[PDB]
Amino acid sequence: ETREQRAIRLARMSAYAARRLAN
């Protein structure tokens, strides 16, 4: 994965995780 794909991956994984595990 490149800097772009990787980054967006971080936001997606973190975002999704935060949703299913906000607290």
Side-chain angles (χ1 to χ4, degrees), residues 12-23:
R12 273 151 90 79
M13 247 275 229
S14 207
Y16 192 52
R19 198 172 261 280
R20 48 144 156 168
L21 299 166
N23 61 89

Side-chain angles (χ1 to χ4, degrees), residues 1-16 18-23:
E1 261 81 32
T2 63
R3 191 101 58 198
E4 197 168 326
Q5 269 199 304
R6 199 155 52 179
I8 64 171
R9 208 234 267 191
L10 314 183
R12 273 151 90 79
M13 247 275 229
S14 207
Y16 192 52
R19 198 172 261 280
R20 48 144 156 168
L21 299 166
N23 61 89

